[PDB]
Amino acid sequence: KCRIEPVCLLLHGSPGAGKSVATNLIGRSLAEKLNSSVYSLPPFDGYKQQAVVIMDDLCQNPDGKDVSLFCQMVSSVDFVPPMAALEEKGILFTSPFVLASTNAGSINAPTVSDSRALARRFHFDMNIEVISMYSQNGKINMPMSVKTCDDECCPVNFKKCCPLVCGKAIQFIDRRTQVRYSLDMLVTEMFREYNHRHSVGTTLEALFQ
Numbered sequence: 001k002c003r004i005e006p007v008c009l010l011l012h013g014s015p016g017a018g019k020s021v022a023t024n025l026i027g028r029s030l031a032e033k034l035n036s037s038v039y040s041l042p043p044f045d046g047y048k049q050q051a052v053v054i055m056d057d058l059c060q061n062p063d064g065k066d067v068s069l070f071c072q073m074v075s076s077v078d079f080v081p082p083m084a085a086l087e088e089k090g091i092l093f094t095s096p097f098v099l100a101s102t103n104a105g106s107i108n109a110p111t112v113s114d115s116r117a118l119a120r121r122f123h124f125d126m127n128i129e130v131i132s133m134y135s136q137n138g139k140i141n142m143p144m145s146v147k148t149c150d151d152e153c154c155p156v157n158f159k160k161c162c163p164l165v166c167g168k169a170i171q172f173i174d175r176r177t178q179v180r181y182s183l184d185m186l187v188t189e190m191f192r193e194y195n196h197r198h199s200v201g202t203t204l205e206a207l208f209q
């Protein structure tokens with residue numbers, strides 16, 4: 001149990017809510033801070049210890065295999081993804097971030113213990129809301145949402161701003177506290193938690209716990 005636990009995000013949205021756009025942008029911003037890239041987990045072909053793993057469109061009813069793998073990934077246990085069937089060598093999983101999206105209001109695992117294990121691991125658990133101006137027919141308008149903002153915007157974690165970044169088009173709502181974030185703000189939060197987990201103070205604290 002020598003690995004720092006990945007920082008994990010779950011986004012709940014609807015099919016047209018731009019869930020995958022959101023995880024892609026959050027993921028890329030975080031990955032760039034670590035000089036790395038994003039890897040989408042095929043539901044481990046192509047995994048190369050990328051800093052950010054994305055799991056898009058989690059089903060509402062994961063089975064025991066889904067639960068088991070996810071709980072390996074998001075933990076402090078050394079974990080070698082299964083690669084034998086791909087005839088590739090075993091390598092330790094080291095991604096410090098895992099982002100997931102789902103259309104489910106609530107994920108329901110097979111047992112309530114399983115549900116507790118998932119809840120423990122989704123540190124950030126947010127609803128996506130698309131702002132009505134930027135949605136037609138239940139589908140987010142990407143041309144509108146990617147259009148560069150004027151200079152009233154100066155983003156923290158991106159080189160330029162658009163409504164996707166600063167909360168004009170999409171917002172993220174904490175499911176426990178109802179606190180609201182722009183995508184940019186959420187990246188700041190996720191990287192702060194990463195820095196917290198990797199700090200000397202935190203790691204030395206664990207010697208006494």
Ligand SMILES: CNCC[C@H](Oc1ccc(C(F)(F)F)cc1)c1ccccc1
Binds near residue numbers: 062067
């Ligand atoms: C095989 N069952 C559906 C595939 C699977 O769905 C999942 C649903 C939930 C979870 C968990 F456990 F909540 F993390 C993990 C996976 C999934 C979805 C997207 C990416 C990887 C795996």
Ligand SMILES: [Cl-]
Binds near residue numbers: 113114
């Ligand atoms: Cl149980």
Ligand SMILES: [Zn+2]
Binds near residue numbers: 163166
């Ligand atoms: Zn903006």
